[PDB]
RNA sequence: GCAGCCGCGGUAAUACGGAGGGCGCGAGCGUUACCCGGAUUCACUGGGCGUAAAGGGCGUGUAGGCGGCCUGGGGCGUCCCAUG
RNA sequence: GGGGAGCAAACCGGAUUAGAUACCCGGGUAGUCCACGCCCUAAACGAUGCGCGCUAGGUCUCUGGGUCUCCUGGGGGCCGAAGCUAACGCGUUAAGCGCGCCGCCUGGGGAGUACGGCCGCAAGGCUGAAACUCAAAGGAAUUGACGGGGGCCCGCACAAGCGGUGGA
């Protein structure tokens, strides 16, 4: 029970003697606007069917974004193939200043203020993935402190 | 019922594979190599068999089902009989999907439950004698492949596999579904993929025979009798 | 030939960790051992110990990792996710105090060489001094 | 100039009620009450999904149209609001709300925002004892916003203050009904204004 | 005839032309020209070179660039304070 | 300047072919060979600059040393961890992780052209544009189609027959 978004829809061709033969691809985001978002890419031979598919997939591929007051805990830059996303967190009332794709993903995550640039290939699908991977990677003076102290944590805390 | 370092030697549990096939990751479980073959540190095997059996036990004590897996010709009849005495097992072929595509596989279960239904029935003597045989054949194959899977009414709480590098399909599936993997692992294997390991000969009857029984022994110990 | 031995140190640690080595040795140096001393405090490594390889001074760096993970790849989170040399020979990088940077919104380290010691960004900004910007970590 | 032209219609393009009109915007006549679809030949036909631009655009327009105001005056305030220490999303509305044309309407002297601009421009308004007739004049806190001693007798002036019999005025304001004066106390915090706007979308529309 | 670009128009044109209707701004709105942006497309920040454009045909070696471990002096670079 | 067996640009003659003016055949000069002096280009290719450190292993091979089951150096190959890559692939012979230094690239055609300069006996080489024009030029991979590509299979498809059409 999340909101869904359409990143993008495309049509694609095979070949058989006597014609092209088509298939559809849907890129779908799914969020609960409070720190959980999932991305799904589904292909079927019919467009709405593909989206259904896509939506199913999205919910299985879910990522808990640690939102820190409308924004993300530190800056971060992530490459995926040719494509590369940068996420710089921002102050209140800044807005999601991000491209076409990352926005949709960020918005449904529950993010409200954040800085962004795409870089390298701009391909939707990889930018989609680079963003989801970027968010999959964020940590906290908390998340981090446990990793480093860790090996005797709870002596100082 | 525990196990002696001695009994393990007699099994020939420590006899690894040749040096040719070999996973360097596995080195942490090796004493040395004599005449080409790595010899598994039993002093280790034993201390892992403990951590591992301790898991198997509480899991059983809490009602968990353990799926046993062995495709290898050596294992088969050992996996089978050992499982039965009370879990499910796979010993013919690991059908890709059995875990991650569990639904459409177990679909095939209701098919044979329903063909079993049809052969105890009058309604069978109806169909033309050609579909009749061709339906007994459908049933027959299903029993072959599924006679142990058909006990799983939901995904296992853990799977116990004999030879992870042979089975790393089964293994991959388990890890993707966050089901704990337990394996009898030789030197050819990535031990990192095995949540609960037992390093020792994955090859000889006398080896598997020992391990699997003591496992199962432990299971019905901690199932009340 | 060898030209940056601090690069070499960092990179030794980087490559080590990616293979989950428990530890790696690095040819010793008053300086390097200072940088290690820092990395120790901040919890990126369990610590270093001074050892001797063939009667050659070395520094055994003992690496630290995340906990095992479930899912189909269980190789622990890194603790030193990213280590990187900033001032290099053939382009040195000096920073005034009001130009010492922040690494990962405070979550990371910048190691600085100053006339008052080898300091972390925070340590240095507290003593009110700057210097050579060696590396960044997180 | 400012926008004159048919209004219950933007009421309809924005698909929500803007209260651009006045006494009937409240009655069973706003055509939102009768034809909630947008104007034109095609407003009957099912919509296409909006582009991000579309939604960013329209949310801007909805907000702007509510307040009267040219885009050049509008953008110039959003600009000023970004140069402010504050949360510009909010700072903006506070700035908007600071307009005399608006202060007057919120005060309840004018039936509507449009009617308010005239009341200002035709000189019917006192600010701190003096006359003001720029609808754009910015009211600061501590300002007293009165009706001219002259224009005290208008039908609508009196007819509107008699609706104040049973309304109560915004929390950042104080009305002196009998004395025909109102005072501007502080800037409205975001929570006071209850517009149907997602201010953040406006901000986003401008960072393109 | 349109056309910034991809393209549109060969008898059903949401792309030409007119009309109705709509959108955007409003004493202004468009066009052309020029600068910066977008263009991490000269990449200091911030790019590359097996096959996409890109390793000199190979060596020798000049200027230059760069350079191991410990201790101490100098304090040029570098860093801090005060002041102009 | 010497040398010339065999071969063989051009050239001579035979064939082929719609025409050969090439591919096939018979000849044959330069040249191919030696010395000396020039030329200085190449798919001069690993299409991968040099040096150094770091990052699983397996196997084949050339070549050193040892307490030579095996251990330990230096080469040459194949397969592969981690990683890298647009992919193909690379993967301790890196195209991985890093530092130093050099050379080079910046859309296709125009064009390795023009102009200028340098070298050269010459042929020519090195260095190297723009106007203009296009909206692509490109790399790898996917499905298909096709091949005077390969593999296996089938149809009265050929073959083996019997009887006809084409003539009246
Ligand atoms: Mg988290
Ligand atoms: Mg890249
Ligand atoms: Mg902040
Ligand atoms: Mg690009
Ligand atoms: Mg583009
Ligand atoms: Mg095996
Ligand atoms: Mg300075
Ligand atoms: Mg801008
Ligand atoms: Mg036109
Ligand atoms: Mg048009
Ligand atoms: Mg038209
Ligand atoms: Mg009209
Ligand atoms: Mg009009
Ligand atoms: Mg630029
Ligand atoms: Mg650079
Ligand atoms: Mg480039
Ligand atoms: Mg080429
Ligand atoms: Mg090339
Ligand atoms: Mg070369
Ligand atoms: Mg070249
Ligand atoms: Mg020199
Ligand atoms: Mg020097
Ligand atoms: Mg030095
Ligand atoms: Mg010194
Ligand atoms: Mg000194
Ligand atoms: Mg001094
Ligand atoms: Mg000095
Ligand atoms: Mg200085
Ligand atoms: Mg001669
Ligand atoms: Mg001839
Ligand atoms: Mg001839
Ligand atoms: Mg001849
Ligand atoms: Mg040596
Ligand atoms: Mg050897
Ligand atoms: Mg070798
Ligand atoms: Mg290979
Ligand atoms: Mg790999
Ligand atoms: Mg090497
Ligand atoms: Mg490269
Ligand atoms: Mg150029
Ligand atoms: Mg050009
Ligand atoms: Mg050239
Ligand atoms: Mg040439
Ligand atoms: Mg050339
Ligand atoms: Mg010339
Ligand atoms: Mg000459
Ligand atoms: Mg040359
Ligand atoms: Mg190709
Ligand atoms: Mg064929
Ligand atoms: Mg025939
Ligand atoms: Mg015949
Ligand atoms: Mg006839
Ligand atoms: Zn209305």
Curated annotation (Swiss-Prot), chain A:
Q: Any miscellaneous information on file?
A: Is positioned such that it could physically interact with spectinomycin.
Q: How does it assemble?
A: Part of the 30S ribosomal subunit. Contacts proteins S4 and S8.
Checking InterPro entries in the record gives: Ribosomal_Su5_D2-typ_SF, Ribosomal_uS5, Ribosomal_uS5_bac-type, Ribosomal_uS5_C, Ribosomal_uS5_N, Ribosomal_uS5_N_CS, Ribsml_uS5_D2-typ_fold_subgr
- GO biological process terms on file: translation
Task: Give the domain note.
Answer: The N-terminal domain interacts with the head of the 30S subunit; the C-terminal domain interacts with the body and contacts protein S4. The interaction surface between S4 and S5 is involved in control of translational fidelity.
The residue ranges of the S5 DRBM domain are: 2-65
UniProt KW Lipid metabolism keyword: no
Gene Ontology CC? small ribosomal subunit
Mention one GO molecular function: structural constituent of ribosome
Record carries keyword Metal-binding: no
What organism does the record attribute this protein to? Answer: Thermus thermophilus (strain ATCC 27634 / DSM 579 / HB8)
Q: What does this protein do?
A: With S4 and S12 plays an important role in translational accuracy. Located at the back of the 30S subunit body where it stabilizes the conformation of the head with respect to the body. Binds mRNA in the 70S ribosome, positioning it for translation.
Cite the entry's keywords alphabetically. Answer: Ribonucleoprotein, Ribosomal protein, RNA-binding, rRNA-binding
In which family does this protein belong, per the annotation?
A: Belongs to the universal ribosomal protein uS5 family.
- Name of this protein: Small ribosomal subunit protein uS5
Swiss-Prot record, chain B:
Provide GO CC annotations from the record. Answer: cytosolic small ribosomal subunit
The record ties this protein, via InterPro entries, to: Ribosomal_uS2, Ribosomal_uS2_bac/mit/plastid, Ribosomal_uS2_CS, Ribosomal_uS2_flav_dom_sf
Q: Does the keyword NAD apply?
A: no
Q: Name it.
A: Small ribosomal subunit protein uS2
What is this protein for, i.e. what is its function?
A: Spans the head-body hinge region of the 30S subunit. Is loosely associated with the 30S subunit.
Q: Name one GO molecular function term.
A: structural constituent of ribosome
The major lineage groups are: Bacteria, Thermotogati, Deinococcota, Deinococci, Thermales
Protein family according to the UniProt entry: Belongs to the universal ribosomal protein uS2 family.
UniProtKB keywords: Coiled coil, Ribonucleoprotein, Ribosomal protein, RNA-binding, rRNA-binding
Q: How does it assemble?
A: Part of the 30S ribosomal subunit. Contacts protein S8 and may contact the N-terminus of Era.
User: Gene behind this chain?
Assistant: rpsB
* Coiled-coil features, chain-numbered ranges: 101-146
What is one Gene Ontology biological process annotated in the Swiss-Prot or TrEMBL record?
A: translation
Which positions form S-S bridges? none
Curated annotation (Swiss-Prot), chain C:
Q: Which family is annotated? A: Belongs to the universal ribosomal protein uS8 family.
Per the record, what is one GO cellular component?
ribosome
Its name, as the record gives it, is: Small ribosomal subunit protein uS8
Kindly list the biological process annotations in GO that this record carries.
translation
One MF term in the entry's GO annotations: structural constituent of ribosome
Please tell me whether the keyword Transit peptide is annotated for this protein.
Answer: no
Q: Can you name the source organism?
A: Thermus thermophilus (strain ATCC 27634 / DSM 579 / HB8)
Question: Per the record's keyword annotation, is rRNA-binding included, yes or no?
Answer: yes
Q: Please name the Gene3D superfamilies in this protein's record.
A: 3.30.1370.30, 3.30.1490.10
Q: Which gene carries the instructions for this protein?
A: rpsH
Q: Which Pfam families match?
A: Ribosomal_S8 (PF00410)
What functional role does this protein have? One of the primary rRNA binding proteins, it binds directly to 16S rRNA where it helps nucleate assembly of the platform of the 30S subunit central domain. The combined cluster of proteins S8, S12 and S17 appears to hold together the shoulder and platform of the 30S subunit.
Q: Where are the transmembrane segments?
A: none
- Subunit annotation: Part of the 30S ribosomal subunit. Contacts proteins S2, S5 and S12.
> Which terms are listed as keywords in the entry?
Ribonucleoprotein, Ribosomal protein, RNA-binding, rRNA-binding
Swiss-Prot record, chain D:
Per its record, how is this protein called by name?
A: Small ribosomal subunit protein uS4
Name the domain of life.
Answer: Bacteria
Give an example GO cellular component term for this record.
small ribosomal subunit
Q: What does this protein do?
A: One of the primary rRNA binding proteins, it binds directly to 16S rRNA where it helps nucleate assembly of the body and platform of the 30S subunit. Binds mRNA in the 70S ribosome, positioning it for translation.
Concerning its family, UniProt says: Belongs to the universal ribosomal protein uS4 family.
Q: Which InterPro entries match?
A: Ribosomal_uS4, Ribosomal_uS4_bac-type, Ribosomal_uS4_CS, Ribosomal_uS4_N, S4_RNA-bd, S4_RNA-bd_sf
**Quick one: which gene encodes this?**
rpsD
Give the CDD domains listed for this entry: S4
Pfam families attached to this UniProt entry: Ribosomal_S4 (PF00163), S4 (PF01479)
UniProt keyword list: Metal-binding, Ribonucleoprotein, Ribosomal protein, RNA-binding, rRNA-binding, Zinc
The free-text note explaining how the cofactor binds reads: Binds 1 zinc ion per subunit. In a number of structures (e.g. 4Y4O, 5FDV) a 4Fe-4S cluster is seen in place of the zinc cofactor.
Binding residue positions for Zn(2+): 8, 11, 25, 30
Spell out the PROSITE patterns in the cross-references.
Answer: RIBOSOMAL_S4, S4
State the Gene Ontology terms under molecular function.
metal ion binding; rRNA binding; structural constituent of ribosome
Lineage runs: Bacteria, Thermotogati, Deinococcota, Deinococci, Thermales
Q: Which SMART domains match?
A: Ribosomal_S4 (SM01390), S4 (SM00363)
What HAMAP family does UniProt report for this protein, alphabetically? Ribosomal_uS4_B
The cofactors required by this protein are: Zn(2+); [4Fe-4S] cluster
């Amino acid at each position: 029970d999340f909101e869904e978004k359409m990143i993008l829809i495309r049509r694609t061709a095979r070949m058989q003697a006597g014609g092209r033969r088509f298939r559809f691809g849907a890129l779908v985001v799914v969020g609960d606007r409070q720190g959980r978002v999932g991305l799904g890419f589904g292909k079927a031979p019919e467009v709405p069917l593909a989206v259904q598919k896509a939506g199913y997939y999205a919910r299985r591929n879910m990522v808990e974004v640690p939102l820190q007051n409308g924004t993300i805990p530190h800056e971060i830059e992530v490459e995926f193939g040719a494509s590369k996303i940068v996420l710089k967190p921002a102050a209140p009332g800044t807005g999601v200043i991000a491209g076409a794709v990352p926005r949709a993903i960020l918005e449904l995550a529950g993010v409200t203020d954040i800085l962004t640039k795409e870089l390298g290939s701009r391909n939707p699908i990889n930018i989609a993935y680079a963003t989801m991977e970027a968010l999959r990677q964020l940590r906290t003076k908390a998340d981090v402190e446990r990793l480093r102290k860790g090996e005797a944590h709870a002596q100082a805390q | 019922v525990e196990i002696t370092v001695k009994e393990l030697l007699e099994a020939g549990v420590h006899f690894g594979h040749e040096r040719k096939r070999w996973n360097p990751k596995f080195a942490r479980y090796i004493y040395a190599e004599r005449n080409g073959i790595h010899i598994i540190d039993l002093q280790k095997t034993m201390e892992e068999l403990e951590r591992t059996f301790r898991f198997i036990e509480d899991l059983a004590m809490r009602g968990g089902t353990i799926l046993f897996v062995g495709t290898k010709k050596q294992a088969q009849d050992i996996v089978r009989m050992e499982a039965e005495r009370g879990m499910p097992y796979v010993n013919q072929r690991w059908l890709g999907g059995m875990l991650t595509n569990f639904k459409t596989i177990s679909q095939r279960v209701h098919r044979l439950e329903e063909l079993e239904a049809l052969f105890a029935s009058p309604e069978i003597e109806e169909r033309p004698k050609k579909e009749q045989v061709r339906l007994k054949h459908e049933l027959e194959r299903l029993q072959k492949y599924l006679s142990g899977f058909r006990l799983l009414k939901r995904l296992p709480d853990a799977i116990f596999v004999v030879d992870p590098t042979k089975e790393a399909i089964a293994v991959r599936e388990a890890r993707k579904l966050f089901i704990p993997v337990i394996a009898l692992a030789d030197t050819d294997s990535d031990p990192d993929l095995v949540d609960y390991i037992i390093p020792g000969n994955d090859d000889a009857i006398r080896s598997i025979q020992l391990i699997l029984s003591r496992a199962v022994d432990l299971i019905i110990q901690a199932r009340g009798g | 030939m060898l030209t940056d031995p601090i690069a070499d140190m960092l990179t030794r640690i980087r490559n080590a960790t990616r293979v989950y080595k428990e530890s790696t040795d690095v040819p010793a140096s008053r300086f390097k051992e200072e940088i290690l001393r820092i990395l120790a405090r901040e919890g990126f490594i369990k610590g270093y110990e001074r050892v001797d390889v063939d009667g050659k001074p070395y520094l055994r760096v003992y690496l630290k990792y995340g906990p095992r993970r479930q899912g189909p790849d269980p190789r622990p989170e890194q603790v030193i996710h990213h280590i990187r040399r900033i001032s290099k020979p053939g382009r040195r990088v000096y920073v005034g105090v009001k130009e010492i940077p922040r690494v990962r919104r405070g979550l990371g380290i910048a190691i600085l060489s100053t006339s008052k010691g080898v300091l972390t960004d925070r340590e240095a900004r507290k003593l009110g001094v700057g210097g050579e910007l060696i590396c960044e970590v997180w | 100039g400012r926008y004159i032209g048919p209004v219950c219609r933007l009421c309809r393009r924005e698909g929500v009620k803007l209260y651009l009109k006045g006494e009937r915007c409240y009655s069973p006549k706003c055509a939102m009450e009768r034809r909630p679809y947008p104007p034109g030949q095609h407003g009957q036909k099912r919509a296409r999904r909006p582009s991000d631009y579309a939604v960013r655009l329209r949310e801007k327009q909805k907000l702007r149209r509510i307040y009267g105001i040219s885009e050049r005056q509008f953008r110039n305030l959003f600009e000023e609001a970004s140069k402010k220490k504050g949360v510009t999303g909010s700072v903006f509305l506070g700035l908007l709300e600071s307009r005399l044309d608006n202060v007057v309407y919120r005060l309840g002297f004018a039936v509507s925002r449009r009617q308010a601009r005239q009341l200002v421009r035709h000189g019917h308004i006192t600010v701190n004892g003096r006359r003001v007739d720029l609808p754009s004049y910015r009211v600061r806190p501590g300002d007293e916003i009165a009706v001219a001693e002259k224009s005290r007798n208008l039908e609508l002036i009196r007819q509107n203050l008699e609706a104040m019999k049973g309304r109560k005025v915004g929390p950042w304001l104080s009305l002196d009904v009998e004395g025909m004066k109102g005072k501007f106390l502080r800037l409205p915090d975001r929570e006071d204004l209850a517009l149907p706007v997602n201010e953040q979308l406006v901000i986003e529309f401008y960072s393109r």
